[PDB]
Symmetry: C2
Subunit: 323 residues, 2 copies
C-alpha cells in the first residue's frame, strides 16, 4: 500500500499477477497533463463535446483534427479512445437546430443525430481517422441500442476511409472501433454486438439511468439512481463475458470505474480497462496492487449473489477497510 | 373459427395448452366490449381516468364505486388493477407536479405514490374494499427493485390493518404483483419473483426503456422496436423466473395483442395475454391453430435470431402458414 510518487509508474497488477489498464477520462486536450501525472496508461474516453459547445457553428474538420492530434501525440503511443458526438437537445446548442423534446435523454441525440446528419458525422470521423496516423486511436460510438446501428455507422466510416484513400491521406487502417454500453439492450445483446465491435466501454452512469429508468439529475427521484443495484452488476458481467468470448476487451468509463468500492468487484469480473478522472488513478491502483485476483473473483461472486444494492455497498465498504 | 363461435371457445392449442386471454380497460364502460369479445378477465385496469380532467383527487368513494362496478360485472373473472401510473407530463393542475427534463424517467407512478402515500392509501383502500366483491389483483407500475415492492406492500399492509380495525372486508388473500417495464425489474426478475404474486409485462414501456427511446418522439420513433432480441430475452427472463417460483406471467403491453408475436409468446410459456377487447378473437384463433410443441420450436428459432427485421419476417411467414 504505497504513495502517489511511487505508484505513478508501477503497474495496476495484483500480487498474483493479473494486470489491468487504468486510463483517464478527458474532455479537452488540456486534461492530458494531469492524466500523465497520475500515470494514465491511455485515455479510455475523450469526450468531444467541447468542440461543439459554446459556439454558433460546427467545428471544422481541421479544428477537430488538431485537437485530436494533440492528444494522440502527447499520449505517446498509449491508446486514445475518442467517443463520437454524444449530445442531445438537453444541451442548448442552437446552431444544431435540435428538436424540442419531451424526453431528450430518450430522444434524437448522439449516434442518432449523427446517423441522421451524416455530414456532421463524416467530418468528425475524418478528423479522428486523420489523427490516427499520429498515434494509437480507437473510436467509440455512443447511444448504441442495436448491432444494426453499429453497421450503419461503420458503413459511414468505411465511406470516409475510402475518400481518404482517394485523397492519399493516411489513417490507421487497423483502427479499433467499439461502442459505449449505456442503452440496456446493448448489454442484453452484447453477444450479438461483440461479433461486430472491437471492444466495449461501459458508460455506467448512463446505463444505470436507463436500466433503472431514472434521470439522476431530477432532484425528485435522485434516490432511484443506484449504481450498485444487482441489475447493473449483472449487465456489466454480461458485457465483459461477451467481449471476452469473441476475444475483445471490456473497458468501463462510467464513474463506477473510479470508485474504490467497485474496484475489487470490477477486477474480479475481469474488467480489462478502468477509465476515470485522472486523480482517481492512484487510488484504484493501490487497491488492485493489494488484492489477489483469486480473492477478487471470490468477492465479485459474493457481490453477484446479493439482492440489494445497500447490502453490496456495505460489503464493499468492509472489503476496503480490510484493505 | 368465426367470432361468434370463438367467443366461448378457450384459447387452447390442439395439443392442449390453455392460456388466459384478458382485456385491458381504461374505464368501467369498457367491460361490455371485453365480455362481448370473450375476455376471461381484465389483465390491466388502468386507473388514470379517475385522476384526469378534474380539479382535485378522486375520493376513495368515487374510486371504490368504479372498481366495484368492474369487479362485479366481471363475474368472478380476475380484474388486475394497476395503481396510479402517471407523472407531470400530464394535465394534473391540482397536484403541482414539478417541471421535469425527462418526465418518463422521473417523478411518476409508484414514485409519486411512495412520496405521496396519502394518495396511494386512498386508492389502495378503494381497491381492497372492491376486492370483497370479486376477484381482484393489485399491480404496481414503474418498479425498478424489490425494495420498492417492499415499500409499497408496507403501505398496503397498513391500509389492510386500518380496514381490520374498522370492520371493513377485503380479500385477505388478494394477489399483488408488478408491471415489468423498467429493465432492471426483468434483469432481477428472479429476485422479484420471491416477493411478488405474479408479473405482468408492460412491453410498450419495457421497449422504450430497454432501447432508450420515447416512442412518442417523431424524430426517433424508428428506434422503438418491440422485436429487438433484447425485448424477447427480457420477456423470457421474466416468464422463466416466475414459473420456477410457481408464479404466473402475464403480458398487457401491445405485443400481447399482436398476431405476429402470438406464437412466440405462446412457446415462451406466457400464461395470460391481456389486450384491447377486439384483439381477443384474433389471438384466440391463432392459439387454437398452432401446436404448443410447434410454438416452442418457433420461439426457440426467434430467440436464436439477431435482428428484429428478421424475427418479423419470420413471424409474417408463420402467420401465413396460418
Amino acid at each position: 500500500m504505497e504513495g502517489l510518487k511511487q505508484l505513478k509508474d508501477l503497474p495496476a497488477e495484483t500480487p498474483d499477477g493479473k494486470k489491468v489498464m487504468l486510463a483517464a477520462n478527458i474532455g479537452t486536450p488540456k486534461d492530458v497533463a494531469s492524466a500523465l501525472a497520475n500515470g494514465a496508461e491511455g485515455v479510455g474516453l475523450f469526450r468531444t463535446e467541447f468542440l461543439y459547445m459554446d459556439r454558433n457553428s460546427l467545428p471544422s474538420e481541421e479544428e477537430q483534427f488538431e485537437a485530436y492530434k494533440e492528444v494522440v501525440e502527447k499520449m505517446g503511443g498509449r491508446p486514445v479512445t475518442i467517443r463520437t458526438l454524444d449530445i442531445g437537445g438537453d444541451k442548448e446548442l442552437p446552431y444544431l437546430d435540435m428538436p424540442k423534446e419531451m424526453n431528450p435523454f430518450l430522444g434524437y441525440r448522439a449516434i442518432r443525430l449523427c446517423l441522421d446528419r451524416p455530414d456532421i458525422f463524416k467530418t468528425q470521423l475524418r478528423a479522428i481517422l486523420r489523427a490516427s496516423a499520429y498515434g494509437n486511436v480507437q473510436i467509440m460510438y455512443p447511444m448504441i441500442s442495436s448491432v444494426e446501428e453499429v453497421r450503419k455507422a461503420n458503413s459511414i466510416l468505411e465511406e470516409v476511409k475510402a475518400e481518404l484513400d482517394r485523397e492519399g491521406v493516411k489513417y490507421d487502417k487497423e483502427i479499433k472501433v467499439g461502442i459505449m454500453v449505456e442503452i440496456p439492450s446493448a448489454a442484453v445483446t452484447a453477444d450479438i454486438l461483440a461479433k461486430e465491435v472491437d471492444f466495449f466501454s461501459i458508460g455506467t452512469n448512463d446505463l444505470t439511468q436507463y436500466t433503472l429508468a431514472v434521470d439522476r439529475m431530477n432532484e425528485h427521484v435522485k434516490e432511484y439512481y443506484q449504481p450498485f443495484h444487482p441489475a447493473i452488476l449483472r449487465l456489466v458481467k454480461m458485457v465483459i463475458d461477451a467481449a471476452h468470448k469473441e476475444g475483445k476487451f471490456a473497458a468501463m468509463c462510467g464513474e463506477m470505474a473510479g470508485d474504490p468500492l467497485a474496484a475489487v468487484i470490477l477486477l474480479g469480473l475481469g474488467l480489462d480497462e478502468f477509465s476515470m478522472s485522472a486523480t482517481s488513478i492512484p487510488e484504484i491502483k493501490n487497491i488492485i496492487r493489494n488484492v489477489e485476483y483469486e480473492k477478487a473473483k471470490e468477492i465479485a461472486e459474493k457481490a453477484l449473489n446479493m439482492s440489494e444494492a445497500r447490502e453490496i455497498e456495505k460489503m464493499m465498504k468492509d472489503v476496503i477497510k480490510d484493505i
